[model samples]
Target: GSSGSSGKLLRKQESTVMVLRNMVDPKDIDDDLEGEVTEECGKFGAVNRVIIYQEKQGEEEDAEIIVKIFVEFSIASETHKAIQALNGRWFAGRKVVAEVYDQERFDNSDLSASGPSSG
Candidate 1:
């Protein structure tokens, strides 16, 4: 009873990505700012994933806090609208970060990385 077309139609037809550009303060993450932003993103619809880039190893002290907020939705228009709404603003105390490629580009990775197989 399930046709793929129906499912496709329900999802976003096209999506574009944008970055917040402004760097986030490293100290903010120390105070759990990433968690707050991730929660706010959830309120919008579905946050595909929230990736925070912190210190590596030796660069721990010099590393910067870079947050990549990936949001996927059921409509391209919605994604565009969300990106527009967040233009260079602060969300949950951390500067709004970038929206990488549309979900399709990373859909493969997302699917394969989920479930017990990922573990």
Candidate 2:
């Protein structure tokens, strides 16, 4: 049975996010790297945030723990520019896989854009 709430979380504005997989190293994805990410992504439009998520390491001898990077832009159209420019791009000897992030999944994620409410 569906609740009265449609499960749709309202966004403050129109934004588009992208996920970049196979980052070179999960360890270097902070501060400076964030700046770099912003600088690059900002070329298309206003950048909201650049987030990094670390994947669990595999048991295979040659398996490397990959880091996924998500970049959020202020406008959806901006993401198209970034995608056209960055998709299939290579970085640190790894082929960068960039794609539009799933907003539906993100809205349902544990983290909330607005922190704990004061009211």
Candidate 3:
């Protein structure tokens, strides 16, 4: 080697947070009905918390409900898969959305700047 010189660089794996959100009608916030949903979540894996966010500001006839869940990111990948699993079912008559929160990018913009030629 003629004094080994710089060549290319490789990217590294980053960590990210995951959160789940589900919107539904305020009428579906039954304490008893939620039992099943919560149970289903637990069956999947660890569930830090299952919170229900509701807004009573809407009109009486057009009120809506927004359910936000804060759970452990132990298995973000699995969580995502689970969300997709419920593509078309009968959950509050609406589809739920689940995904990983890419906070790593905020911490480091160079996070996704990696491939096989960028050293």
User: RMSD per prediction, one decimal?
Assistant: 7.0, 9.1, 10.9
- Worst 10-residue lDDT window for candidate 3 reads 106-115
Candidate 3 global Cα RMSD: 10.9
TM-score of 1: 0.46
C-alpha-based local distance difference test score of model 3: 0.51
Cα lDDT tens digits for candidate 3, 1-119: 85659765585543323345664556666887456556777655665444444444457786654554433334655555555554333556666666554544424423224333446
Ranking by lDDT: 2, 1, 3
Candidate 1: worst-modelled 10 consecutive residues by lDDT: 110-119
- Full ranking by TM-score: 2, 1, 3
What TM-score number comes out for model 2? 0.68
Residue-level lDDT for 95 in candidate 2: 79
lDDT of 2 by residue, 15-91 (tens): 38888876568766657887888887778899988777775578888687877688888778888678776788878
Count of backbone collisions in candidate 2: 0
